[PDB]
UniProtKB/Swiss-Prot annotation:
CDD domains xrefs: ABC_6TM_MRP1_2_3_6_D1_like, ABC_6TM_MRP1_2_3_6_D2_like, ABCC_MRP_domain1, ABCC_MRP_domain2
EC code: 7.6.2.-, 7.6.2.2, 7.6.2.3
Organism: Homo sapiens
Record: residues binding ATP 2: 1167-1174
TM region positions: 2-22, 43-63, 69-89, 102-122, 141-161, 245-265, 292-312, 369-389, 393-413, 476-496, 519-539, 808-828, 866-886, 930-950, 952-972, 1044-1064, 1067-1087
Membrane topology field: Multi-pass membrane protein
Protein name: ATP-binding cassette sub-family C member 3
Length: 1364
């Protein structure tokens, strides 16, 4: 005791000197000593010294067994000469990061640590040898390893360091504020706060993110991996990615394993301190401060167990990001230059899957990776204390929980083989959705739509019944985190009681053990996640091996240093092949091109043209020969390559933008016509990111880029293949030809054209990969050989009401039945724990233990309920969630079918497919589990808080300020991290957009020697994602610190209010209070983890419910207002001053229509170009609502008739008739309303009987999407049959001569003539052949009636009808 005190001298010295040292460390402006190997090891002695200042402590705690609870001096000295070492190894780090080299204060610290250890050193030696032997070897070795460590640390701190050499001024913008951050301010992540403020008063945009720090800018971490991967090769004086990946990410992973080790060896302090508190709180002779001290250093040892952890995550997420960046960078570097053969063999859509998956799950593996050893050290240690505590019974408990690793992975393999192996129902349903969406027109003019509604409802209900048992087996992840704690504690206590009835249960056993099971159970449920992620990353690593071990394409295929005089391109009898094994396509080909000479290449289709130019660039492995060039080149691939950026970039292509040259190239290529058409000018987006440019324009822009690149040797490749002929002549005239700009440029042209030949200079004739004839066309025309044969708030948190909406979609008899039922379960759980307390403090007084068999019993029947009242809840939540989907999905679908055609016109059919794809997916199987786990976490927190309050009644005083602080931190997080999540989720996809673009364009990326220039772009596009995935990680950490002080300032108060009322209560209550206050910082991150996994997901319900009540304005059927049955046979059409327009506030297309055709008569409509005759058709079916004027049919107004009855009676043949995938029975009669014989009879008349009879499926002939397996004409025949079945008195035609051939036009006109003599006929067409024969014809012009009479009367009037 005269020396245990003496060891306190250096600790108190360093502690008191610390606040008078950080005010001088900041008096050094900036030194930034480089990380030498001395300072890298001056802080490894200290951490190891803490780890031997641990056994110097837990030896003291071993007195708990054998009875002797240690005196405070006997267990605080190792606990505080252990904390300072985590501060010695931290002033070592923070000093080096400042200018100081000779530490001064810290060398004194180590010196005193040595000096105060001299006296026991000068004493323990003499007492040992003289009196015998070991004499308590544990305190001996823990001392003499401490002495060696401190001596070595002093010696190493006696050395000098390098001069600061620091820097000049770095850069102006907001720099990453971890550099230039004081000691106390970087320990607690206080520097991030500036954004936590700015992330709440304003929104965040890319201009205001942390300008990323220099070490990891994705071009300094790729290099750190390329160097390792290169140096890790065969090395004779085979290679594996894993070795390089370790050698380049081992420095940042054995410095993030020290933190995990420190944390999980610092975590086993609190259960033992709790044991000390419980077993002093019973003692009435122990002075008061022996409990106050334990509470104090149960706080100051739990605001440090979770500060070397929330500071762990900062160092193993910012290495997950470095995995995700090094992998992507090296893969991109490879994919630029491998081979065209390897691309052809593999899939261009698969290479990109080497990011966003299959190489990003390395970012998802980093946090789980250290679990590999931290699980077998959180167990073989937490088993030890438990065994020490309850005895062998503990095994059973842990055994059960270990047993819960497979049966929590068995569902993870039943599910994931029950929701993706059978989600093809979703695939087929979304296919049917896409089919229904486009072509909705003909689907809606006739009443086919509700049959499709029935079809999709049936497939949906099939997809949901397979989703019932796809979520019940998810209520086994609400059985691990809400019902397993009680089960494991019960089984432990059960085996403990049954094995031998002589062992009582007291507070310091039961409650320490149930507070230690907590510590063991977090890294024993994320362990199955480890198995899953590691076993699906062990294949990703193999795949990245497969990609990186692919042959490059530079065996110096071309040399660009020497050339024959006056020549630009020459090849010496070379041979080329598209694959290293396949027969060479080219055999000993020889061409000598003079400078500036245009050369054309000829042949038939399949002689080897396109494989000539591809060989010149160096993408065709030459078996023999030497290919030469001199100067830059420009390549125009046949499948022209369009960059996924703006037109200015996609034409300038990394050059200097000169408006004079730029504009003249654009006009010479004849692309200004598109520019005047372009909606935004020459800045329009291109590619999948922009307007999908058709084939014609892509070659124009490619050729323009080539010519503006003004390289020496243009290697063209039939760019005029997919363009209009006349402009193509100008394209050759103004650009390629000698009159054009490129007279002095060595052009090489390969094309199938003929007319361009005479204007060329030289021509090369290709046959089976061999040259036959060379020379000018007028000279070659003398030969006339086989070549002659070639000739012929808007932004913010969601409103509260939407939550209610979701409840109204679950039934609202289930919402009460689930909220009330969790309230019941929480009451049961608190009852179980209170009963355990009243058992454990009962066992100490009662002389009779015979009563135990009751308490145990009821404990079971009071916690088993808490299982049976949670599972029976979680199912009735999942079995509500799918219900919540069902109705909700219906309420969307049944409205989108009922929307006006203008809704589908103003929309590109992409947004209305976003829903039914994702926004219906989130409410389908992403929202129900999240809300279930939120509702588990909230009630876990409630049960914990109420048990703490109940056990120590006066603790309620502080429960408000903790609540306000925690809510403040939660709100600040939910602002700033929401901003960052949005800003990062939208900036990552440009990486994969820039990829999937170099892969296709690797041919044209090279030959512009732009490969290096084109990977810096990938570096900056992943940099613009790193600079918003870093501050999100740090924001998460700053939150978790804020929610951790308010989860440790409650352990402090639980212990303190336990010790302040010692005279009142009995030990069974403080044990419960403290042991359930130790996990009020786990059920307080879980309740935020979910409350932000539901704020970013219940946006989906708002959107889905918003897509409703969208002005359907179309009642399918009416109440009793149906027109009289047998309605068509009257068949009279009559108008009264009709006028209509597409949209409100739109120029009238129809005006004052007053037309009438009698019953059974035939009539057509003709309109001049621009009259707007098409709309008339839709006006008959009430597609456009009658603006002014009632279209009366048979003396009845159609505006008061149900469409499903109104449209059924009429008969339409649409302008663009379409088939729908499925049988023919569906494609002619979904309602099954007609006899098959007449169907076949109509099919016979449809000129299709030979086709249907030739197929045994016939009526069941499975049509492709739109009947693509049939020809166009056959599709109009099928739709002609479609109209044939209905056979009503009213017939109307839509564009009988729109674009069909004259052959089928004759057939359709004849079919119209033969059967439809009696029935009323209306007609619209581009050709008067079917109209001139009508009894009466109306002529529509600019939306008014002009000529409504017989064609003979029209002939006399000589209008537009008779004009031509
Ligand atoms: C902590 C993290 C990592 C990242 C997420 O945590 S979050 O607070 O940053 O969202 C999810 C997750 C939960 C449990 C964590 C885990 C990574 C590995 C951990 C730290 C262990 O060995 C014990 C606890 C495990
Ligand atoms: C909450 C979550 C993640 C979601 C899981 O539920 S699931 O339905 O998503 O599988 C439960 C799960 C396990 C451990 C949880 C973790 C989220 C973050 C937590 C709370 C910490 O910082 C410590 C423990 C971590």
């Amino acid at each position: 005791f005269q020396n245990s005190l003496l060891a306190w001298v250096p600790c108190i010295y360093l502690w008191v000197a610390l606040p008078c040292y950080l005010l001088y460390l900041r008096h050094h402006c900036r030194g930034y000593i480089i990380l030498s190997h001395l300072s890298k090891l001056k802080m490894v002695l200290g951490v190891l010294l803490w780890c031997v200042s641990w056994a110097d402590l837990f030896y003291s705690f071993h007195g708990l067994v054998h009875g002797r609870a240690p005196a405070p001096v006997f267990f605080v000295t190792p606990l505080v000469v252990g904390v300072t070492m985590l501060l010695a190894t931290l002033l070592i780090q923070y000093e080096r990061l400042q200018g100081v080299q000779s530490s001064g204060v810290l060398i004194i610290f180590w010196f005193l640590c040595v000096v105060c250890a001299i006296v026991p050193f000068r004493s323990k030696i003499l007492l040992a040898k003289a009196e015998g032997e070991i004499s308590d070897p544990f305190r001996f070795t823990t001392f003499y390893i401490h002495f060696a460590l401190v001596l070595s640390a002093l010696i190493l701190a006696c050395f000098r360091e390098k001069p600061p050499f620091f820097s000049a001024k770095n850069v102006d913008p907001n720099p990453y504020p971890e550099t230039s951050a004081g000691f106390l301010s970087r320990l607690f992540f206080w520097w991030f706060t500036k954004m936590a403020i700015y992330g709440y008063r304003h929104p965040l945009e890319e201009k205001d993110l942390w300008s990323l720090k220099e070490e990891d800018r994705s071009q300094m971490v790729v290099q750190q991996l390329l160097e390792a991967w290169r140096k890790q090769e065969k090395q004779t004086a085979k290679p594996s990615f894993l070795k390089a990946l370790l050698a380049t990410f081992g420095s940042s992973f054995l410095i993030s394993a020290c933190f995990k080790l420190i944390q999980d060896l610092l975590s086993f302090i609190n259960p033992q301190l709790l044991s000390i508190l419980i077993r002093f709180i019973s003692n009435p002779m122990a002075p008061s401060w022996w409990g106050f001290l334990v509470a104090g250093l149960m706080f100051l040892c739990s605001m440090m167990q979770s500060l070397i952890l929330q500071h762990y995550y900062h160092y193993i997420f910012v290495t997950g990001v470095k995995f995700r960046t090094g992998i992507m960078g090296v893969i991109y570097r490879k994919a630029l230059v491998i081979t065209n053969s390897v691309k052809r063999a593999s899939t261009v859509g698969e290479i990109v899957n080497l990011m966003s998956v299959d190489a990003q799950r390395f970012m998802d593996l980093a946090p789980f990776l250290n679990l590999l050893w931290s699980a077998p050290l959180q167990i073989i240690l937490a088993i030890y204390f438990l065994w020490q505590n309850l005895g062998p019974s503990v095994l059973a408990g842990v055994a059960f929980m270990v047993l819960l690793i497979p049966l929590n992975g068995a569902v993870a393999v039943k599910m994931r083989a029950f929701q993706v192996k059978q989600m093809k129902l979703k695939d087929s349903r979304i296919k049917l959705m896409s089919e229904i969406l486009n072509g909705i027109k003909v689907l809606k003019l006739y009443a086919w739509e509700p049959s499709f509604l029935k079809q999709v409802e049936g497939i949906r209900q099939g997809e949901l019944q397979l989703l019932r048992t796809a979520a019940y087996l998810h209520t086994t992840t609400t059985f691990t985190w809400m019902c397993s704690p009680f089960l494991v504690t019960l089984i432990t206590l059960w085996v403990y009681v049954y094995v031998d009835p002589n062992n009582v249960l007291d507070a310091e056993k039961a409650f320490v053990s149930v507070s230690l099971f907590n510590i063991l159970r977090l890294p024993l449920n994320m362990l199955p996640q480890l198995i899953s992620n590691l076993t699906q990353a062990s294949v990703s690593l193999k795949r990245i091996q497969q990609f990186l071990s692919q042959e490059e394409l530079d065996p110096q295929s071309v040399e660009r240093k020497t050339i024959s005089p006056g020549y630009a391109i020459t090849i010496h009898s070379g041979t080329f092949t598209w694959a290293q094994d396949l027969p060479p396509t080219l055999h000993s080909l020889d061409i000598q091109v003079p400078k500036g000479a245009l050369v054309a290449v000829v042949g038939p289709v399949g002689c080897g043209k396109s494989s000539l130019v591809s060989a010149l660039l160096g993408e065709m492995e030459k078996l023999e020969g030497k290919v030469h060039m001199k100067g830059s080149v420009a390549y125009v691939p046949q499948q022209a390559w369009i960059q996924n950026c703006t037109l200015q970039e996609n034409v300038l292509f990394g050059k200097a933008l000169n408006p004079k040259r730029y504009q003249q190239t654009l006009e010479a290529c004849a692309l200004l016509a598109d520019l005047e058409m372009l909606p935004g000018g020459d800045q329009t987006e291109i590619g999948e990111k922009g307007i999908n440019l058709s084939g014609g324009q892509r070659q124009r822009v490619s050729l323009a880029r080539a010519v503006y690149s003004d390289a020496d040797i243009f290697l063209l490749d039939d760019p005029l293949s997919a363009v209009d002929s006349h402009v193509a002549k100008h394209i050759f005239d103004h650009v390629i030809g000698p009159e054009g700009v490129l007279a002095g440029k060595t052009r090489v042209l390969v094309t199938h054209g003929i007319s361009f030949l005479p204007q060329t200079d030289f021509i090369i004739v290709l046959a089976d990969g061999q040259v036959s004839e060379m020379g000018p066309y007028p000279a070659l025309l003398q030969r006339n050989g086989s070549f002659a044969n070639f000739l012929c708030a808007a932004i913010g948190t969601v409103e509260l009401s939407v939550f209610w909406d979701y409840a109204k979609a679950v039934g609202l008899c289930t919402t009460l039945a689930i909220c009330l039922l969790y309230v019941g379960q929480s009451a049961a759980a608190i009852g179980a724990n209170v009963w355990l307390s009243a058992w454990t403090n009962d066992a100490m007084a009662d002389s009779r233990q015979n009563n135990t068999s009751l308490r145990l019993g009821v404990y079971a029947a009071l916690g088993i309920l808490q299982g049976f009242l949670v599972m029976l809840a979680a199912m009735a939540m999942a079995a509500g969630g799918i219900q919540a989907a069902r109705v909700l999905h219906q309420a969307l679908l049944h409205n989108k079918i009922r929307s006006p055609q203008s809704f589908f016109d103003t929309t590109p059919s992409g947004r209305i497919l976003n829903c039914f794809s994702k926004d219906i997916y989130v409410v389908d199987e992403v929202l129900a589990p999240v809300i279930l786990m939120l509702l588990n976490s909230f009630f876990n927190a409630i049960s914990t808080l109420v048990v703490i309050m109940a056990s120590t009644p006066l603790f309620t005083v502080v429960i408000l300020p903790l609540a306000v602080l925690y809510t403040l931190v939660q709100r600040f997080y939910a602002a700033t991290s929401r901003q960052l999540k949005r800003l990062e989720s939208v900036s990552r996809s440009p990486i994969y957009s820039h990829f999937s673009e170099t892969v296709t364009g690797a041919s044209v990326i090279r030959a512009y020697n732009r490969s290096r220039d084109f990977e810096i772009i990938s570096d900056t596009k992943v940099d613009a994602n790193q600079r918003s995935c870093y501050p999100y990680i740090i924001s998460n950490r700053w939150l978790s610190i804020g929610v951790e002080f308010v989860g440790n300032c409650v352990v402090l108060f639980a212990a303190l209010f336990a010790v302040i009322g010692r005279s009142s209560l009995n030990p069974g209550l403080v044990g419960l209070s403290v042991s359930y206050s130790l996990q009020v910082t786990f059920a307080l991150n879980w309740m935020i983890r979910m409350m932000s996994d539901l704020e970013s997901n219940i946006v989906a319900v708002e959107r889905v419910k918003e897509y409703s009540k969208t002005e359907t304005e179309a009642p399918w059927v009416v109440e009793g207002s149906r027109p009289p049955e047998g309605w068509p046979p009257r068949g009279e059409v009559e108008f009264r001053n009709y006028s209509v327009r597409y949209r409100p506030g739109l120029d009238l297309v129809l005006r004052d229509l007053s037309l009438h055709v009698h019953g059974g008569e035939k009539v057509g409509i003709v309109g001049r170009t621009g009259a707007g005759k098409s709309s008339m058709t839709l006006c008959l079916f009430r597609i456009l609502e009658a603006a002014k004027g009632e279209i009366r049919i048979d003396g009845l107004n159609v505006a008061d008739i149900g469409l499903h009855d109104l449209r059924s009676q009429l008969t339409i043949i649409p302008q663009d008739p379409i088939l729908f995938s499925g049988t023919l029975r569906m494609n002619l009669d979904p309602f099954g309303s007609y006899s098959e014989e007449d169907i076949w009879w109509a099919l016979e008349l449809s000129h299709l009987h030979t086709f249907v009879s030739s197929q045994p499926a016939g009526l069941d002939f499975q049509c492709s999407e739109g009947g693509e397996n049939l020809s166009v004409g056959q599709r109009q025949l099928v739709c002609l049959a479609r109209a044939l079945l209905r056979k009503s008195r009213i017939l109307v035609l839509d564009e009988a001569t729109a674009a069909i051939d004259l052959e089928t036009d004759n057939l359709i006109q004849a079919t119209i003539r033969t059967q439809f003599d009696t029935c009323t006929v209306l007609t619209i067409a581009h050709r008067l052949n079917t109209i001139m024969d009508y009894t009466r014809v109306l002529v529509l012009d600019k939306g008014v009636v002009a000529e409504f009479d017989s064609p003979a009367n029209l002939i006399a009037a000589r209008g537009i009808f008779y004009g031509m």
